[PDB]
């Protein structure tokens, strides 16, 4: 199957409160496996999955040192961007980065990412050709021209096609066994009389992982694209997720409806009636 290794970088300034706050977070196939946070007590790269604890002390100190230098570099980027945009020096600002790669089953790279955001908005991104940049505005075009002169795209493409996927192959060999973890949903339906004429049939799905799931209500064969309400699936707090979906139905006519629960840890989708 396709796999990914990506890093989510945050730097946010605190005018007057000292050095800015700096974070690196690593994901393998969307699950957090390493974390560095400059506001922990002894900033260090830390394991965030217990399979990552195979890696030796040289790994951790190599990555800690790299993070410290990345951190030193984002404090300049913050001061640089204020000037490019000519903004007041009083305010808090953010830089965010998404960097990594998505690889196919042959282990070759499918998707490479190098994308920047300033104050929640796009700033510059490495295009999919892995040779050119998209700047979002005039400030970002300053960065673009300079990264063209540096051969920054070529530096990135070498990283993304090589280093990045090699490291991922090394991480999959360690936490593959863990990453395939699937928990099946546990579903049930709850009943709520609504004044005066209405019942609310709520379909719950709980204990499931991963969080990708689909819930539908059907009125004798059809799918109810309306009247149906739906919560963004939510972490329960223990590594499993939650979702519910419901709808309001007239009275004594709650035999006509059926919930269906679509999840990869189900051999067959679930069908539930009240």
């Amino acid at each position: 199957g396709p796999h990914s290794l990506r890093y989510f970088v945050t730097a946010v300034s605190r005018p007057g409160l000292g050095e800015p706050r700096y974070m690196e977070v690593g994901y393998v196939d969307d699950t957090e496996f390493v974390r560095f946070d400059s506001d922990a007590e002894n900033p260090r790269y830390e394991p965030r999955a217990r399979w990552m604890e195979q890696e030796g002390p040289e790994y951790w100190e190599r990555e800690t040192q790299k993070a410290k230098g990345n951190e030193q570099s984002f404090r300049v980027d913050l001061r640089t961007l204020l000037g490019y945009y000519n903004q007041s020096k009083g305010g808090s600002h953010t830089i965010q980065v998404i960097s990594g790669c998505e690889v196919g089953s042959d282990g070759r790279l499918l998707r490479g990412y190098q994308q920047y955001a300033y104050d929640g908005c796009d700033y510059i991104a490495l295009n999919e050709d892995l040779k050119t940049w998209t700047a979002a505005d005039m400030a970002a075009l300053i960065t673009k021209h300079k990264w063209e002169q540096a051969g920054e795209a070529e530096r990135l493409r070498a990283y993304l096609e090589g280093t990045c996927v090699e490291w991922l192959r090394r991480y999959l060999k360690n936490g593959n066994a863990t990453l395939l973890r699937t928990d099946s949903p546990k579903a049930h339906v709850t009943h709520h009389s609504r004044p005066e004429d209405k019942v609310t049939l709520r379909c719950w799905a709980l204990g499931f992982y991963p969080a990708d799931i689909t819930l539908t209500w059907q009125l004798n064969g059809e799918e109810l694209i309306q009247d149906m309400e739906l919560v963004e699936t939510r972490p329960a707090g223990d590594g499993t997720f939650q979702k519910w979906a419901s709808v309001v139905v007239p009275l004594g006519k709650e035999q006509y409806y059926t919930c269906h629960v679509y999840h990869q840890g189900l051999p067959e989708p679930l069908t539930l009636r009240w």
């Binding site: 890093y7 690593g26 993070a67 570099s73 984002f74 640089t80 960097s99 990283y159 990045c164």
Partner: peptide, 8 residues
Amino acid sequence: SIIVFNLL
């Protein structure tokens, strides 16, 4: 392993 980043 994350890349060393360059300046904006």
